[PDB]
């Protein structure tokens, strides 16, 4: 890592954050260094915590389009460490391999269909600098999800948005299962 | 108007009870933005979200001067001039020194900025493309400049300005007229 300055506490330092931890490992297997970085400022882990825990909670998008947001997210914003992990995921998660480790040609792949590609476009062109979203990519969303939907669409990629740039500012670096999970969809 | 037809604002009367979320937002600003009324249609979200947010106001180990210069910095890097007008306005309102705020975006040359600032915002600017364009003298400038508790409230500010540039962007949200007084100034 090029960043020596801020390092991860032991977990067992600080047992207050339990539910922040429990939160991010619960879908990935482990607990990223990054959220134990994090924990050292208790108000941020808590409150981060917090937002991140939306994101299960959501309920007008299906599971499998939860995960793929944040692929597609993250990696449009070029956070490898971020694609590796929700690919991670994605793939702990899916009952379809195939269809997971074709997300990055969705626009391509017949795995996905006309809604799934509205929403993954979006969040291509949402997450970029500056972001390219034009008006094809309002109608589409329009074309097929609810308000509540876009909503839902709209959060994933903005909580990407925040851990793309924390992970970054951390230099967080990839673990060796996220990274086997990353050169396989690679 | 906005590209985006879909997902529209309630009115401020329908949601009070984030009401506690708003005053955060609008305190420094002066104003409630439509975003964050998109946001109120989702509660999960809208007090989550102003929870992270109220975080920047309560950070200790920097000042507040910074705070918003690196919320302006991060989301001129990124390219959202919505959030770059927003916390240029806010850090107008906040500071007592308006020249400085007008020259925050030339920080690596204006004299209103010192070493220690310019290695915050040169931080922030680097944090905040696509990708990051992040280096190792990045980190050492930090590290040169500030603590490890001032380093996790500067990347959380950053971080924080990830998810609002993108939500922002999401939502086409359309400059008012008093952020783009401001906006068209420091341009």
């Not at 991860?8 to 600080?14: F, H, I, K, M, T």
């Not at 995960?67 to 956070?79: L, R």
């Not at 793309?164 to 060796?176: K, L």
Request: hydrophobic share 45%.
């Amino acid at each position: 890592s090029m960043n020596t300055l801020v390092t991860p506490l032991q977990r067992s330092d600080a047992p207050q954050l339990e539910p922040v931890f429990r939160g991010m490992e619960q879908n990935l297997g482990f607990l990223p260094n990054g959220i134990l970085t994090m924990g050292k400022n208790p108000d941020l882990a808590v409150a981060f915590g917090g937002l991140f825990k939306c994101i299960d909670a959501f309920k007008h998008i299906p599971t499998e389009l939860k995960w793929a947001i944040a692929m597609i997210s993250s990696s449009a914003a070029g956070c490898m460490y971020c694609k590796s992990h929700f690919s991670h995921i994605a793939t702990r998660t899916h009952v379809n391999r195939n269809k997971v480790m074709a997300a990055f040609e969705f626009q391509t792949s017949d795995f996905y269909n006309e809604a799934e590609r509205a929403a993954l476009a979006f969040a291509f062109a949402n997450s970029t600098s500056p972001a390219h979203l034009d008006k094809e990519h309002f109608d589409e969303l329009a074309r097929y999800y609810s308000e509540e939907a876009a909503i839902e669409i709209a959060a994933i990629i903005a909580i990407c948005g925040f851990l793309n740039r924390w992970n970054a500012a951390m230099d967080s670096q990839i673990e060796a299962a996220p990274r086997a999970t990353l050169d396989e969809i690679e």
